[PDB]
């Protein structure tokens, strides 16, 4: 969502690279981190 | 047929007389009120305050138009006049009674109510 | 069909660059180069963005038009022709070269095809 | 570096209006602090503020000391339009000479205050440098 400025929720929410892209991931709809 | 401010009498008794045609009811564009159709106009004048009253925001339908209606029966029908009936959101008349005949139509687009009240449906 | 044997060449793998380059080189001077290979051809990795640029030849459509060929055949059309000008010789120099698909006479097959191949 | 008309004819002799220096707590060794590298008539206000919000998030022991302070100022629109411009003051600060000793998060073991200041940098404006002092930070 935040497109710009993502940084680790749940004590897990991972750091993944898709299309060089960095989009938050972690066992929660409440983390759908993306930029 | 019948829009902007073309006028048309009553045949029911709702307590009216004649009514100005605001919008043709249906959805955007649309430019026409042909019997069966439903109009968004008001009172140009109504009896001595029956129940309606001059200049009353309104909702009425199509039943008399000298515009001539082509019956799927390659037939043709029209009238000496142009007017219709009021209604209760629920495509339901008010006039307790009818007046000049009308046309199958109505039925086809819901209204029986008048369909039969009518003195004669042509 | 069959022709001369003047400029007897082909293509495949190589670098879709200097490739044409000389093609003309002799494209100039005053020679005819009929080869072929298209597909086989070759050109920058980064396929992806690889097939992009030339899709930039793809839908580059300008009312006034702007076709932008859709078969290897072209790719080389452009490019090459690129090497030259547009007054006489050059021009002609564009009729004097000719290539084709598989083989009529004794990564370079994806962008095309891709955008038309 | 355009600066003002004089220290007592235009606008010189003020308090600049702000929120004093020291906070946090002592600490003999532990060198915990902050400085910069950017040049900028440090935005007073912005300034004053910032630092403060700093205390807002911590509270007590962590040299919430801070070695800054504006003392001159700009000016602009007031009068005719654009031409012969008189001057109407507003917004003093101080030159953050391309880096230098900012404020200090100084104390034994109290990073619970390092993070703070941290929060203090975040804020600020001109980027900022996160650092330690003689020894580091413990």
């Amino acid at each position: 969502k935040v497109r710009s400025s993502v940084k680790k929720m749940c004590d897990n929410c991972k750091v993944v690279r898709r299309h060089g892209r960095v989009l938050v991931i972690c066992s929660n709809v409440k983390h759908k981190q993306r930029q | 047929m019948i829009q902007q401010e073309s006028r048309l009498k009553v045949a029911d008794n709702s307590g009216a007389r004649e009514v100005l045609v605001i919008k043709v009811l249906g959805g955007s564009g649309r430019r026409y009120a042909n019997i069966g159709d439903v109009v968004v106009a008001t009172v140009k004048d109504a009896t001595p305050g029956g129940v309606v009253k001059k200049g009353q925001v309104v909702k009425a339908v199509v039943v008399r138009t000298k515009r001539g209606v082509r019956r799927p029966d390659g037939s043709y029908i029209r009238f000496d006049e142009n007017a219709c009936v009021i209604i209760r959101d629920d495509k339901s008349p008010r006039g307790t009674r009818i007046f000049g005949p009308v046309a199958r139509e109505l039925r086809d687009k819901d209204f029986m109510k008048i369909i039969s009240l009518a003195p004669e449906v042509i | 069909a069959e022709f001369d044997a003047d400029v007897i060449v082909d293509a495949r793998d190589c670098i879709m660059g200097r490739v044409a380059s000389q093609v003309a080189e002799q494209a100039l001077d005053g020679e005819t180069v009929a080869v072929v290979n298209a597909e086989r051809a070759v050109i920058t990795g980064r396929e992806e963005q690889i097939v992009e640029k030339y899709e930039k030849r793809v839908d580059i459509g300008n009312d006034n038009g702007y076709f932008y060929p859709k078969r290897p055949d072209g790719i080389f059309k452009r490019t090459i022709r690129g090497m030259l000008p547009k007054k006489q010789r050059g021009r002609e120099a564009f009729e004097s070269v000719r290539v084709y698909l598989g083989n009529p006479y004794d990564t370079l097959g994806e962008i095309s095809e891709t955008l038309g191949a | 570096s355009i600066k003002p008309t004089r220290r007592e004819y235009i606008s010189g002799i003020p308090g600049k209006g702000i929120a004093q220096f020291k906070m946090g707590n002592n600490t003999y060794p532990a060198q915990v602090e902050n400085v910069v590298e950017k040049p900028v008539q440090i935005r007073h206000n912005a300034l004053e503020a910032a630092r403060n919000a700093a205390n807002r998030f911590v509270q007590n022991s962590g040299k919430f000391r801070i070695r800054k302070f504006p003392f001159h100022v700009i000016r602009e629109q007031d009068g005719d339009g654009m031409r012969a411009p008189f001057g109407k003051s507003v917004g003093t600060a101080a030159r953050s000479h391309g880096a230098n000793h900012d404020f200090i998060a100084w104390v034994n073991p109290d990073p619970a205050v390092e993070f703070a200041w941290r929060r203090a940098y975040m804020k600020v404006t001109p980027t900022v440098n996160i650092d330690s002092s003689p020894a580091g930070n413990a």
Binding site: - | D73, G74 | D63, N64 | -
Partner: protein, 191 residues
């Protein structure tokens, strides 16, 4: 010849059950000229004279079944088109000509207070100042009447021979009776 076609009979409606207007169409089997194939090399149109008597005054189903009637001797009666079907026909506009941006192209003209002023018919404008001269956009008095017109969802109702002729569902053949009609039921949707 890949298809089937002839000319405009005319229009009239009448009968049915609710009633419905169509159009008549003339055409037995206008013989069979070669047939489409690009085999061994380039092949398309031959001509083993067998035509009319005057014609030298000027001297894979669709096409396939053809082979059926085009080898028979030439001609080929029209009408698979049967009871309730959708071919498509391509008339020829109608020598209507060069007209004003009026009917040629829908548009509102000279309003009132000036909707007469010995004023009238004539488009509103072209292009702005900075944009650039002109567009190939806004049509123009783009002549009409000749266009190779046609359409779709062309449903045929019935047919009979007495003279091989066809009855149609809604005419609009484009061109006029005695006119050049060609039909098909292309990528039908009503299928």
């Amino acid at each position: 010849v890949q298809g089937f076609a002839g000319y405009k009979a005319g229009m009239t409606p009448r009968e049915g059950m609710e009633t419905v207007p169509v159009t008549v169409i003339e055409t037995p089997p206008m013989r069979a000229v070669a047939l489409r194939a690009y085999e061994q090399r380039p092949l398309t149109e031959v001509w083993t004279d067998e035509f009319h008597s005057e014609l030298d005054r000027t001297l894979s189903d669709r096409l396939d079944h053809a082979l059926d009637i085009v080898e028979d001797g030439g001609e080929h009666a029209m009408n698979i088109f049967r009871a309730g079907e959708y071919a498509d026909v391509a008339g020829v506009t109608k020598g209507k000509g060069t007209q004003g941006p009026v009917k040629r192209w829908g548009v509102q003209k000279r309003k009132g207070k000036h909707a007469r002023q010995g004023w009238r018919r004539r488009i509103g404008n072209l292009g702005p100042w900075n944009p650039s001269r002109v567009r190939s956009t806004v049509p123009q008095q783009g002549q009409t009447g000749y266009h190779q017109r046609t359409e779709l969802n062309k449903r045929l109702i019935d047919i009979g021979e007495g003279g091989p002729y066809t009855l149609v569902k809604g005419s609009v053949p484009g061109p006029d009776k005695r006119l050049v009609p060609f039909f098909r039921a292309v990528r039908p949707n009503d299928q």
